[PDB]
Design a protein around this ligand. Structure first.
Ligand SMILES: O[C@@H]1[C@H](O)[C@H](O)CO[C@H]1O
Length: 270
């Protein structure tokens, strides 16, 4: 009987997570596993029922990308109680027994983004941060890194506000902030979806604002190459997914794995 590895992804409405899924799928096939992928649709309740389902299906390992690094504890507990090893991908779990966490160094990433803004505009720039989901380690860490850049480069932070990794929210929040914080010079958007929404708001307002994104999605890089998006801190979602499956395979083979597996970042510019 072919063995199954389960992947629960926070959403498939975001190109980044489609890439992560694809990387996990190709590596699963390469190593001889059936990959079962369930979409949490950014909903912790659906995530819980997803983990229940994959469990009754006899998944040998659970790869989970939490909708919320706190809320996910109860979902991890399901796998724990049913003796299914857990690997977290891209976002961590605050509680629950986890074998390995695989993600970018999102603190370094946030600092890279801020450093790039300073390189372009100089110290003392007026900036706005569009934050991701506050409950995720990815957003929290990017904020921490950006704070390091704010202090090092004496940025004037006009606003720092969530748009929940969503393109439409990114647009709406930016539209509002362009009205109230019109002197903003640069925006760090904690993912490319929000970056692209922000760019639409900026253009619609006829304003001049430098934007730095995060992920290096196809759309993100397209916007960078066109000169619309000043830069994006590129991640390797396919590699996060593939490393998840590779790590799952090692666990099942009885081989020890690293507790933390960092995945490299790179600033992509015009
Ligand atoms: O790292 C991922 C990507 O930035 C995605 O775009 C939003 O969720 C984060 O956890």
């Amino acid at each position: 009987m072919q063995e199954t590895i389960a992947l629960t992804v926070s959403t498939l409405d975001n190109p980044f997570f489609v890439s992560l899924k694809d990387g996990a799928q190709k590596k699963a096939t390469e190593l001889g596993y059936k990959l079962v992928v369930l979409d949490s649709q950014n909903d912790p309740s659906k995530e819980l029922s997803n983990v229940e389902d994959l469990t009754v299906r006899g998944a040998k390992v659970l790869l989970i990308n939490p909708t919320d690094s706190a809320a996910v504890s109860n979902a991890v507990a399901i796998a724990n109680r049913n003796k299914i090893p857990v690997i977290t991908l891209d976002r961590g779990a605050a509680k629950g027994e986890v074998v390995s966490h695989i993600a970018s160094d999102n603190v370094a990433g946030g600092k890279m983004a801020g450093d790039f803004i300073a390189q372009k505009l100089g110290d003392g720039a007026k900036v706005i941060q569009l934050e991701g989901l506050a409950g995720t380690s990815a957003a929290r860490e990017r904020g921490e890194g950006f704070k390091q850049a704010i202090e090092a480069h004496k940025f004037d932070v006009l606003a720092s506000q969530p748009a929940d990794f969503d393109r439409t929210k990114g647009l709406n929040v930016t539209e509002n902030l362009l009205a109230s914080k019109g002197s903003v010079q640069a925006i760090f958007a904690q993912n490319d979806e929000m970056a692209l929404g922000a760019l639409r708001a900026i253009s619609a307002a006829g304003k001049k604002v430098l934007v730095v994104g995060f992920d290096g999605t196809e759309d993100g890089v397209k916007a960078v190459k066109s000169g619309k998006l000043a830069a994006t801190v590129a991640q390797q979602p396919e590699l996060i997914g593939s490393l998840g499956v590779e790590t799952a395979d090692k666990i099942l083979k009885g081989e020890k794995v690293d507790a933390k597996i960092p995945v490299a970042l790179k600033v992509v510019t015009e």
